[PDB]
Ligand binder design. Structure first.
Ligand code: FES
Ligand SMILES: [K+]
Ligand SMILES: [Mg+2]
Ligand SMILES: [Mg+2]
Ligand SMILES: [Mg+2]
Ligand SMILES: [Mg+2]
Ligand SMILES: [Zn+2]
Lengths: 197, 74, 126, 294, 54, 170, 53, 108
RNA sequence: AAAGGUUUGGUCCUGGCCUUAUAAUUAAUUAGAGGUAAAAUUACACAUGCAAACCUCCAUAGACCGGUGUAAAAUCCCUUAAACAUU
């Protein structure tokens, strides 16, 4: 239950420049000398879900998991570059490098974060402006003449407001619905009453 | 949902209508709102009905329609 | 299915997942299923506030006018959306419901004031 | 009144195209993208020259400069104020007309606020919702995080100014404040560090020189063009500076002396140059090298 | 008057087409006036109940 | 190895290289050619190379070919009005024959482009639906909108299970 | 095709049913009869709405 | 064998008999009798130009004739008589490939 | 398919079978919690409850929605005419 503690946790990029890294890896990628154990000639289309379960390590730890000092961080661009095609700029699928699915998901997120912050370079296509004409004189983006009701402060339509029915009309309805009536309602409040708190 | 040939429920033989109670002041105001609202919406549906037919006629027998027809024959 | 009778209608077709509703505004024969065969999609309605706190309605106002000109009815929820946008007048029940809510909050405020006055009587008793 | 020259004026585009330059190797540098096996054709010297001509035609369309516009003015128009609906809704509604055949700057995008006010959508709301319903390849619905000053400084250290600008054209509108802010920040960093060569043979060189001329700080670009033996370009820059500032002391001095060619640059040094002493020194050294060697 | 949005779309079209005017768009309600809800209906086109007893 | 001579003729790219799209008037194109001779070489090459391309772009036009019925090869088009357009292709290259028929009875590039745009009028990018017809199935896919509950669990207060418990509690 | 066989019984039923309807058409005295004690129509057993009682 | 030679990027298919010796002899036979661009330029006297889709229309000259450059353009037939293999053409015709084709594999 | 194993004393050719990949159903052994999608032996017989009303009477609706894969090489695509139990 005691996984080793890396000295480069704070500054992961340092490891890739240290002598220890060069001796172990040289100038080849960290996954160059890894081979996966599987039955048959065609391998499974997914790699193992994870190499480390509850501080225990699987039989053939993947390139990232086998080396604890290797850290998948967006700031450690030199490591992330090894998992991206230099010619096509595509992130390799997990079977290509043999990383486990857990680290591959972690690697993909770090590369995407590094690109967004500008630490890791990528190809930006040249695109034309969205609009052929850049005029801003149409009413949609301009000022429409204020409507007469809007200037006066009245409702847009007269029936939006409460118009007290004539007294004769209120009596006509009390006769039609005699015996099934509700208390008469007056004009509603002019504004929305502030919610009690 | 049931078909017309299905039998009615026995739990629901007793049912009789219980019409809602009417507020005279709000019922009248609402009745007039529906009348004026439906008149405004009928005027707009007619205006939209005319734009559809104007556009259709221009395409079928507009200036541009006739010129292209003769241009092809020539 | 081979329908007999009915009319074209503009309504909201419910999509999305559980607790995540999303609507497609569509023109469809009224007898068709809610999420089934339609004639044209006329927009979408997202009833959940987004990151900016905005409920997003999309309306193809050019095609909507075309189908209203051909007899297409409108569902009551769609009439409310067109009223909020400003393309249609506010629906009668949108105004009535707003008035009912105003009268109901006035009562609550009055009751709270009466309770505070009753609490004031308790304060007087000490 | 003599019209102020515009960015798209046929004369300004001529000078800006010339000083920008062309380089088929830089304009058509290989893209880091999914690749296909190359094709091969046997061509005579006549055919090869024809193909180089077509490449130069395409390089011109590739170098078309992006628009330089003034900052749009905030949209603050209230269509209606239906106070009956006050307090009946908690969140704003944003309604977008998505009829296909409307220019995006002529679409109606309105907002029904909780207070009941029906207003026109602001510029930020207009661009966001048009990306949601008319998505443009390269643009994101929410503003990316690369345009933050700290992140932009990272791109500048890596000499990736042409990408910062290529990204600013995919995301923002030319008249937006964010667009102007990012462009003016890239042009200013190029100035301080004299990295004018990064944007040569690119569509972004015209806007950079335009910005310096309008801001009366072409000194660095002249010193850099002279040191690279591009003294025909430097003269055209001083002509563009004498065109957008006709009443300037430098423009009036060149009329008095009918200066041309290298004379125009010497006039600029004495009259309006912020760092005239250096322009003459670099110009003098260039003349010495040209005269001494040839 | 026209609805708030539909009025702005009409005035915007005027300016685009070069028609300069400050006239307020107005809907005509005369052509489409509704009968009362209790107005007698056409009996000739109304249905009749069937002859199968329940 | 693909069978037959010039197997490139049996590729979709070759069939799509045809440029003669006949006007709606054209209904039938009879091809009278001779299998032996010297002045009919272009006609024989036209039947070999071009007739497939013409049929591919004009599926509703009846192309019927007759062999060694006349001294010289010719093309005769039958129009819907009842007009008959006779073309004489003797001493003419197969390419020349294609260019001639394109001019007299071929639709122009402007017309064909207009028809293409009209076909796609009802596709809208904003429309949501299945992948076959639309870019995005749901608004959850859009950035800034509430994500799908399957991918990202919704807040408890936005769930009917939680709201029902409160209503019971009230 | 040609295996879509004719349906004589279906055609016979349609005509026969239609004929019986014309012969045994009900009258206004029967369709609109009412039982005033229960306010229910005997022909269909439909109870009138409460607002009409 | 490709790793031994130094080839890094290539596709190959082997059909018929899988005899290892005939595959080794056939591989070296074909790889040793190929034609470099410089050889083709000398044989035909024309420039050999390369067009990459990632470089646009930019013409790239990969080999120029050693002696005298010709002025007669190479004949371009309207319809080439090349003999095409059905397996290659079958992909562009829209026919379905096998479930075993282009599966995810480790870096080679 | 980037293929592999397996005829012989041995080699080569031809040729089948099988292996390696992917997914669904069931079964053995085994499993905490949460979110989501889908739920499926049987056109076999069905206990019970519910699934169509509305409404000032006339009418309208119960022809839909929902279900199953019965029958049938049954269809797809397209042309013409006509109504529509409609708006
Ligand atoms: S698919 Fe959009 S909410 Fe689930
Ligand atoms: K075998
Ligand atoms: Mg009635
Ligand atoms: Mg089981
Ligand atoms: Mg159904
Ligand atoms: Mg069956
Ligand atoms: Zn691992």
């Amino acid at each position: 239950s005691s996984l080793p503690v890396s000295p480069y946790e704070s500054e992961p990029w340092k490891y890739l420049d240290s002598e220890e890294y060069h001796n172990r890896y040289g100038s080849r990628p960290v996954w160059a000398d890894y081979r996966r154990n599987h039955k048959g000639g065609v391998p499974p289309q997914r790699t193992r879900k994870t190499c480390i379960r509850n501080n225990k390590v699987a039989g053939n730890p993947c390139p990232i998991c086998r080396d604890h000092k290797l850290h998948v961080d967006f700031r450690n661009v030199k490591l992330l570059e090894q998992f991206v095609c230099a010619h096509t700029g595509i992130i390799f699928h997990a079977p290509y490098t043999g990383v486990c699915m857990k680290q591959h998901k972690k690697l993909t997120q770090a590369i995407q974060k590094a690109r967004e912050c500008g630490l890791l370079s990528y190809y930006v296509p040249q695109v034309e402006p969205r609009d052929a004409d850049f005029g801003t004189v149409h009413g949609a983006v301009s000022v429409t003449p204020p409507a007469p009701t809007l200037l006066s402060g009245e409702p847009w339509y007269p029936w939006y407001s409460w118009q007290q029915p004539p007294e004769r009309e209120l009596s006509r309805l009390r006769r039609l619905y005699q015996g099934n009536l509700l208390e008469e309602s007056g004009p509603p409040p002019e504004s929305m009453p502030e919610m009690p708190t | 949902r049931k078909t017309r040939h299905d039998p009615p429920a026995k739990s629901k033989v007793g049912r009789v209508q219980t019409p809602p109670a009417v507020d005279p002041a709000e019922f009248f105001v609402l009745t007039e709102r529906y009348r004026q609202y439906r008149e405004t919406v009928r005027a707009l549906r007619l205006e939209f009905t005319l734009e559809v037919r104007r556009k259709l006629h221009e395409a079928r027998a507009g200036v541009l329609a006739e010129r292209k027809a003769q241009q092809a024959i020539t | 299915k081979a329908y007999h009778g009915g009319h074209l209608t503009i309504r909201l077709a419910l999509g999305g997942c559980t607790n995540r509703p999303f609507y497609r505004i569509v023109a469809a024969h009224n007898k068709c299923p809610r999420d089934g065969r339609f004639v044209e999609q006329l927009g979408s309605y997202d009833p959940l506030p987004n990151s900016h706190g905005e409920k997003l309605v999309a309306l193809n106002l050019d095609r909507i006018r075309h189908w209203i000109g051909c007899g297409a009815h409108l569902s009551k929820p769609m009439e409310k959306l067109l009223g909020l946008s400003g393309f249609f007048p506010l629906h009668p029940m949108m105004i009535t419901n707003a008035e009912r809510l105003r009268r109901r909050r006035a009562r609550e405020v009055l009751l709270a004031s009466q309770k505070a006055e009753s609490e004031a009587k308790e304060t007087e008793a000490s | 009144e003599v019209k102020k020259p515009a960015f798209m004026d046929e004369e300004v585009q001529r000078i800006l195209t010339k000083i920008t330059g062309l380089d088929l190797q830089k304009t058509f540098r290989p893209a880091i993208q999914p690749l296909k096996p190359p094709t091969y054709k046997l061509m005579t010297q006549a055919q090869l020259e024809e193909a180089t001509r077509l490449a130069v035609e395409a390089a011109k369309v590739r170098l078309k400069m992006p628009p330089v516009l003034e900052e749009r003015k905030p949209i603050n128009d209230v269509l209606a104020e239906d106070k009956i609906l006050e307090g009946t809704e908690t969140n704003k509604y944003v309604f977008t007309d998505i009829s296909y055949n409307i220019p995006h700057r002529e679409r109606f995008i309105v907002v029904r606020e909780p207070s009941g006010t029906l207003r026109k959508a602001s510029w930020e709301e207009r661009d966001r919702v048009i990306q949601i319903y008319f998505p443009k390849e390269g643009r994101r619905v929410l503003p990316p995080v690369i345009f933050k000053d700290e992140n932009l400084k990272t791109m500048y250290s890596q000499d990736r100014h042409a990408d910062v600008l290529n990204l600013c054209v995919a995301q923002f509108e030319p008249d937006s404040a964010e667009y102007i802010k990012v462009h003016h920040q890239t042009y200013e960093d190029i100035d301080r560090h004299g990295k004018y060569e990064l944007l040569r043979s690119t569509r972004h060189f015209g806007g950079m020189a335009w910005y310096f001329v309008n801001k009366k700080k072409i000194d660095g670009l002249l010193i850099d063009q002279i040191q690279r033996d591009l003294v025909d370009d430097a003269t055209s820059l001083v002509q563009l500076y004498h065109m957008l500032h006709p009443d300037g002391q430098s423009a009036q001095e060149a009329k008095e002396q009918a200066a041309e060619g290298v004379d125009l640059i010497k006039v600029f040094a004495k009259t309006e140059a912020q760092r005239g002493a250096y322009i003459e020194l670099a110009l003098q050294t260039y003349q010495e090298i040209v005269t001494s060697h040839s | 008057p026209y609805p708030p949005l539909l009025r702005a779309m009409i005035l915007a079209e005027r300016q685009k087409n070069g028609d300069t005017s400050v006239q307020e768009p107005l809907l005509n309600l005369e052509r489409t006036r509704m009968r009362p809800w209790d107005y007698p209906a056409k009996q000739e086109t109304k249905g009749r109940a069937k002859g199968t007893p329940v | 190895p693909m069978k037959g001579r010039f197997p490139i003729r049996r590729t979709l790219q070759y069939l799509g290289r045809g440029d003669v799209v006949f006007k709606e008037s054209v209904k039938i194109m009879t091809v009278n050619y001779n299998t032996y001779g010297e002045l009919g070489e272009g006609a024989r090459k036209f039947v070999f190379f071009n007739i497939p391309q013409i049929q591919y772009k004009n599926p509703w036009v009846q192309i019927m070919m007759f062999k060694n019925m006349t001294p010289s090869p010719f093309l005769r088009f039958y129009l819907d009005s009842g007009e008959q357009v006779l073309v004489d292709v003797e001493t003419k290259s197969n390419k020349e024959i294609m260019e001639h028929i394109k001019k007299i009875l071929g639709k122009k590039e402007e017309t064909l482009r207009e028809e293409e745009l009209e076909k796609q009028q009802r596709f809208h990018p904003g429309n949501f639906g299945p992948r076959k017809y639309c870019l995005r199935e749901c608004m959850c896919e859009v950035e800034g909108q509430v994500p799908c509950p399957g991918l990202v669990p919704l807040p408890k207060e936005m769930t009917g299970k939680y709201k029902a418990a409160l209503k019971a509690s009230t | 095709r040609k295996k879509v066989r004719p349906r004589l019984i279906a055609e016979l039923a349609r005509r026969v049913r239609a004929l019986r309807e014309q012969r045994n058409q009900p009258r206004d005295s029967q369709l609109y009869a009412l039982d005033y004690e229960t306010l229910t129509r005997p022909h269909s057993g439909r109870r009138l709405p409460v607002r009409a009682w | 064998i490709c790793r031994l030679i130094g080839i890094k990027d290539m596709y190959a298919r082997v059909t018929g008999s899988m005899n290892m010796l005939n595959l080794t002899r056939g591989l070296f036979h074909g790889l040793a009798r190929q034609e470099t661009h410089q050889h083709l330029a000398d044989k035909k006297g024309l420039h050999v130009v390369e067009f990459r889709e990632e470089c646009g229309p930019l013409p790239i000259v990969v080999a120029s004739p050693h002696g005298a450059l010709s002025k007669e353009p190479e004949p371009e037939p309207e319809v080439p008589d090349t003999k095409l293999d059905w397996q290659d053409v079958k992909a562009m015709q829209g026919l379905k490939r096998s479930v075993w084709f282009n599966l995810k594999r480790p870096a080679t």
